[PDB]
Structure formats: structure tokens, C-alpha cells
Symmetry: none
Subunit: 186 residues, 2 copies
Amino acid sequence: SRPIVISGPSGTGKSTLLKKLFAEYPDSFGFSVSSTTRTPRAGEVNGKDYNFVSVDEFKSMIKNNEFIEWAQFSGNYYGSTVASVKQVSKSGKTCILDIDMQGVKSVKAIPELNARFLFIAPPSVEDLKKRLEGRGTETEESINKRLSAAQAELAYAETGAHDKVIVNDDLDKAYKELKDFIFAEK
Amino acid sequence: SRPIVISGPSGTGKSTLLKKLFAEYPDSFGFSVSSTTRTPRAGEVNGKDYNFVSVDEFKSMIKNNEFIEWAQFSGNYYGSTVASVKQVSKSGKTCILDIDMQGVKSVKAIPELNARFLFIAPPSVEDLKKRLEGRGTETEESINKRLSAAQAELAYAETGAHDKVIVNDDLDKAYKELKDFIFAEK
């Protein structure tokens, strides 16, 4: 099919959803094989764990706009290239891109990609904020920055920017929805 | 919109046009919030006045390449990270970076910024001289050092490092140009 861009605030259950999807349909979905400038590791295989490039190869890919998204981690670059997305689809699978709002907007400025856009929303900021403090791995500033950045995404979601929006006030229901949408490829 | 880097020798007319643009579009533009290791003084507010951080906060933010620019003032670090410049654009307004030549190069090295480059020129190096005198609050060595950093910047602006060069031989002419550039978003 067409690439499926799935975004939304974390803590909403997006992970369980994608995880359950990838478990239930083990040969049909795929994330894009990411690029890095990080020296390979023991047990990593080029083209499969990562496309390993060089700091200069990565940088020349950035100005050549080959990237959907990229970042710098401790001096190592990461990011996914349009070409690796196509690959997943060349292979006979459906690409899943799990990315932020800024990513959604980038994919959209490449309408040649023809992506699909799915938004996993929390029932409310309240439940999200609370869902967040359930994990237990966070503080004040962290959470607060996590909720401000959600209200932004939520804002972008009210502009009709996505093909579906799934509010997760129940995983099975949402799970059913996530599938009905995916296989409703149009 | 995209971050706009404007530069040019002080005394060109840049400050005036910059103030006019600011008075006419009070809701349109803003500057990033700089970060500092100094302790918040009597009445300051984190996130508004400065992004208050700790020295090691700063230092790793430096190694991890988060700063556009940083300097040291009386024992305390100050700088502009890339996050605060995009904070502006995410917040609905556009970012105006009134930086010098070195600043222009520093931003040109941070591809993730992806900025636009405007440069404001005096009619000649002579007009610069006289106008830097019109304000009269200068000196022999201060007025001279300016004229050198000017031929420098002009030498640089001669290389075509900017998307646009506005000569301020007339303030109404230069004002219309600048707005034409800014609102001729690219």
C-alpha cells in the first residue's frame, strides 16, 4: 500500500497499538530502515539494523533533502530517508512512520510520497497527563512540556490534517479502528 | 514561517527599518529566548527572560551542538540554541535573527535551522562613516574599527552569501524591499 504516517502524543497507547499490529501482521508492516553516522556495533548489519553512512554522507543527504526527519544524538546523526520508505513498499510491505507533528508537515511537503495520516489522540489532556504519570518515569517540567507539546499536536489535528483520528479511551476498540483504517486502503 | 537571519553594519539604517517593521507587525515577529548559566536575578522569569540552566546543562548542550552561538560573560555562559529559534516559528510568529557575519556563518553550519538570509548595505562605505557620525556617539578608533568590519561584511556579502541585499540609499525604498522579502516567503 501507501506509506502510513501515524503520529500523536506519547502515553496515549500508540506503542501498544503498533506493537499489537506488528505482532498480528508480522510480514505486512515495516518502519523505514533508518540512517546513521554511528560506527556499526557488534551484531548490527548494514541495510537491516541501520544504513550506516559517514558524517559527510549524512550531511550531503540533508542538503539533498533525502530525509523525512533526522536528528543528532551525542554527535551521531539518525533519521529516515524517503528512499528507505519506498524500499519497504518495494519489498511488498506497508511502511509505518511513527513521527512527530513536525514530521507530519515534512511528509506533507513531499506529496510525491502519497502518505496516509493517522492520529492517535488521548481522550483528554487530563487522562494523558495522568497516563503520563502512570509510567512513573517523569517529573514536573518534563510532563508539563509533554502536555504543552500535546495541545499543539491536538491543535494541528483540529485542522482536518489527518485521514483518521483515533481517540484511545479503550485499546481493543482503538485497536479495531487502527486495523479497519489500515486495510481500508484508499 | 522560516527563520530570518538579517545582518549588516550597524548604522546602515537596519535598526530603523527593523523598528518600523516591528511597529507595523507587532503580532508577526519575535526573538528567540537565550539560555544562561547565571542565577536568576531579582524578578527574572525562566522561559521568558532567559532559559535558566546549569553549567553542565549548558556544556553538554554545547557538545551536543544545541547552541547557535554562545559566549562567556563575567563567569556565566550565554547563547542561542536552535530549539528556541524554532520555538518561535512553532508559536505562530517568524524568527528575526539580527546576528553579525560570524553569526550568519554559524547558522549556515546548522542545516536543521534552514534559514533565510537578508543583508542591509549602506550606499557606500562613506555614507556609513557619516551616519556613524550623525549619531556622533563614537570615536576615532571606534568609528574606524566599524569601517573595517564593514568592508569585511561587504566583501562577504559580495560573495553572494545572502538571498538578498538591500542598499539603504533611501529608507522608504529599503523598507518596501525588506517587507517584500519577508512576505515573499521562500
